[PDB]
């Protein structure tokens, strides 16, 4: 029972926290059903059920004490779903179905159990392509998933707080990528939507009657970006349209400049901003096979060629466009249909290193899909095989690989919820098509390292104590 667990400290990263004691003083509230029926003695299988009851009490903060109901429904609490699955597993009536205690400790030893915060399954299972968050820290904390399902678009809206979502067609053709602008001086929150027929549209979320459209591009819309202002448009025809943050609220504003950086043979797919504040004046992007950087005055700063990458690595993989870009002290580039990520330097504009995800994956298609990096020197590599690679910027070594939760990571972004907490959204495929959204804590790698050190310390302590006993 929770009365039989003695706490020795409240420090999280402590060597010893909880201990078990039997004061020698089963109880109706915390008894196994097989024991409640009076069939046999407790044996050992039931203890796992009692431990599951303890988990249900710890999760609900003892709300049950003051045919088990849903933990989130009966009492207000964060999902924490891996332990929900564990509780449902070890609270099964069949004593054979109860996992053994060693199995329970093993599946509790995972850092994914702590870092995975939420999980959402879209029932209609519509094939989703893009998703953008809302920086509004108010109760309007949701996502604006977009997908191409019919001759028109499929404009979804997943509400994290309520887990309910509505989808419909409002953009007249298949939609590719989205972006949001929030004008606090104007109290305006506008989302810009693009179709594959070649138009840019805006749809104000504050009222569905406030709809807008922008100037047509002859190719298909390909990318967007909000520079905190200059709204950037990177099209298949290499255009870099700069949209004023203010005027584009009304339908039919106009671009201030058109920089034909690329062409149709090397479309522009991804842009990003310097993570270091010393280079917050230069904006970067990979235009097909061209890594271009430009100023805040809409003037080019550099034009790098990727084609030299064939002489070192395989020419086949090196003969591909750029899919994702990230700007740090070193430039990291991921190319289409390739299992390698290219590392470049922004000063010499020269190749520096290559990282082969194939070695790490086979150590356990391996094609990289998307990238996200944080100033905490931790790199996330989302693979087309549904695996997430964790790499450190200090040593460029492995940290951990996340799998067996989705079949193919589609999009991975960073955002913040209404509680000011920083999390990471990982959209992964599930083909048996099903679309699953997972919310991961931003302290995942540090948590893995801390948990490794903690369990190693506890193992050493137990070994030393048992050795001194013998």
């Amino acid at each position: 029972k929770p009365h039989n667990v003695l706490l020795f400290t409240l420090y999280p990263n402590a060597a010893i926290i909880a201990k078990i004691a039997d004061y020698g003083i089963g109880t109706p509230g915390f008894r196994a059903p097989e024991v409640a029926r009076g069939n046999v003695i407790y044996n050992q299988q039931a203890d796992v059920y009692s431990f599951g009851l303890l988990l249900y009490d710890i999760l609900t903060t003892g709300g049950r004490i003051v045919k088990l109901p849903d933990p989130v429904k009966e009492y207000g609490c964060a999902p924490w779903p891996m332990v929900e699955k564990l509780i449902k597993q070890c609270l099964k009536e069949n004593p054979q179905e109860r996992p053994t205690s060693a199995q329970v400790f093993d599946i509790l030893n995972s850092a994914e159990l702590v870092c995975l915060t939420r999980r959402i399954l879209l029932p209609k299972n519509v094939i989703v392509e893009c998703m953008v968050a809302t920086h509004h820290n108010s109760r309007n904390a949701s996502i604006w998933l977009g997908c191409g399902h019919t001759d028109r678009g499929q404009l979804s809206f997943l509400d994290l707080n309520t887990e309910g979502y509505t989808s419909e067609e409002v953009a007249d053709s298949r939609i590719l990528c989205l972006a949001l602008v929030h004008l606090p001086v104007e109290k305006e929150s506008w989302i810009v939507s693009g179709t594959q027929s070649g138009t840019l549209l805006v749809i104000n979320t504050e009222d569905g009657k406030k709809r807008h459209t922008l100037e047509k591009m002859t190719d298909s819309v390909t990318c967007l970006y909000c520079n905190s202002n200059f709204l950037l448009v990177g099209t298949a025809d290499g255009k870099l349209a700069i949209f004023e943050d203010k005027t584009v609220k009304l339908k039919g504003a106009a671009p201030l400049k058109i920089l034909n950086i690329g062409n149709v043979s090397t479309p522009l797919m991804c842009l990003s901003e310097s993570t270091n504040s010393t280079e917050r004046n230069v904006m970067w992007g990979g235009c097909g096979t061209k890594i271009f950087s430009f100023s805040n005055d809409f003037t080019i700063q550099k034009l790098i060629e990727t084609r030299t990458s064939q002489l070192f690595s395989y020419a086949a993989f090196s003969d591909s466009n750029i899919i994702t870009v990230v700007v740090d002290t070193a430039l990291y580039i991921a190319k289409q249909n390739s299992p390698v990520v290219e590392v470049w330097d922004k000063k010499t504009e020269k190749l520096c290193g290559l990282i082969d995800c194939v070695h790490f994956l086979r150590e356990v298609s391996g094609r990289v899909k998307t990238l996200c990096l944080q100033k905490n020197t931790a790199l996330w590599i989302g693979t087309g095989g549904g695996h997430i690679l964790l790499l450190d910027l200090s040593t460029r070594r492995l940290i951990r690989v996340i799998y067996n939760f989705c079949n193919s990571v589609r999009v991975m972004m960073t955002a913040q919820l209404g509680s000011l907490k920083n999390v990471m959204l990982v959209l992964g495929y599930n083909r048996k098509i099903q679309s699953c959204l997972t919310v991961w804590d931003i302290n995942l790698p540090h948590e893995v390292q801390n948990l490794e050190k903690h369990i190693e310390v506890r193992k050493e302590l137990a070994e030393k104590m048992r050795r001194t006993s013998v």
Partner: protein, 361 residues
């Protein structure tokens, strides 16, 4: 005196085929005449392939001069050749003086100079002696004995057991050490009991800097916004100790240097190639610390403006006698105040003057 041009003629003859002992003679000469023959000691080829005195003479002559550009490079070349000839040479090298010269040579502003090949061969020798992880622990212990905090990080990045032995950390805090070293140690693995003993030692020889550096790991939870100094038997309290524990948003993060990381990365590469070939602190627990008087806290110290936001101050099981009034008027957001199991003799009436006291104990 004539031995100089004699050794020059020997260097002239070292290229003729089948040069074979001649090692012992020139060894005796170099042992006798230190300076000029060492400049020509690069003529030393693979001879003898096990006298420890030979390597001893070599490394002692190296560190003895250690200030002529190309002779150290030649010595490192010869050393690399000898270790390529025999791996047991490594142990002997680390045994005699190897660290004493490597650290002195690469910490003496080795960077900021066009010595790319020099650093390359040096890191090659590093990666070469990086085998036999026991010797890595020895190198770590010796680098910690010296106040050389530049390469302790390099040794850790290559993989070093900070709990090798009296652990390393207690030895570091026993001597007058630098904050960067103890910080790099605490970031890497360290037994909590070892850190505790280290805190006791550092308390014995009062040093607010290292005390704060230790407490930043032992009893700080950035998540809960709390301090958990419960039962550390810290005989007193000092506002400077808890100074760097409060947020102080004016502080920021800046990469002061990265030369250690670059070093470690390049030695790892050479080893791989050789193998291939707001949010204030709203809680402060000071329970069971065997205190005697809590007047050092407040007194308009640095901590004084980081107490107005405190929302809980546990002080139970200590040994107090009174509560300073200035502490009360400074603590303008307390709600829980625990003083049970102390030794009070009369109730201070002004404890109720606080703004938001709700749970007095």
């Amino acid at each position: 005196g004539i031995q100089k041009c004699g050794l020059k003629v020997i260097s002239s003859i070292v290229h003729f085929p089948d040069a074979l002992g001649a090692m012992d003679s020139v060894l005796h000469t170099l042992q006798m005449y230190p300076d000029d023959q060492e400049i020509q000691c690069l003529g030393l080829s693979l001879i003898g392939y096990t006298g420890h005195l030979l390597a001893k003479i070599l490394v002692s002559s190296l560190y003895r001069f250690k200030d002529v550009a190309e002779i150290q490079t030649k010595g490192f070349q010869t050393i690399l050749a000898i270790l390529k000839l025999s791996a047991s040479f490594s142990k002997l090298l680390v045994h005699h003086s190897f660290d004493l010269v490597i650290f002195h040579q690469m910490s003496s502003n080795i960077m900021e100079q066009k010595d790319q090949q020099f650093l390359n061969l040096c890191c090659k020798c590093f990666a070469k002696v990086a085998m036999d992880d026991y010797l890595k622990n020895v190198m770590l212990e010796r680098a910690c004995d010296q106040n050389n905090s530049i390469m302790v990080e390099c040794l850790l990045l290559l993989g070093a057991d900070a709990n090798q032995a009296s652990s390393l950390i207690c030895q570091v805090c026993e001597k007058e050490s630098s904050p960067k070293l103890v910080e790099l140690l605490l970031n890497s693995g360290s037994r909590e009991q070892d850190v505790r003993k280290a805190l006791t030692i550092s308390i014995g020889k009062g040093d607010s800097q290292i005390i704060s550096l230790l407490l930043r790991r032992l009893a700080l939870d950035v998540a809960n916004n709390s301090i958990c100094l419960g039962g550390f038997c810290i005989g007193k309290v000092e506002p400077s100790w808890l100074g760097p524990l409060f947020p102080d948003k004016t502080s920021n993060l800046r990469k002061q240097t990265n030369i250690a990381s670059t070093l470690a990365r390049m030695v790892i590469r050479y080893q791989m190639k050789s193998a291939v070939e707001r949010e204030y602190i709203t809680s402060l627990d000071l329970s069971a610390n065997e205190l005697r008087d809590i007047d050092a806290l407040s007194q308009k110290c640095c901590i004084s403006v980081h107490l107005e936001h405190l929302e809980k101050l546990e002080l139970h099981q200590n040994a107090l006698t009174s509560f300073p009034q200035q502490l009360c008027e400074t603590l303008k957001s307390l709600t829980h105040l625990d003083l049970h199991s102390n030794k009070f003799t009369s109730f201070p009436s002004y404890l109720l003057k606080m703004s938001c006291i709700a749970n007095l104990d």
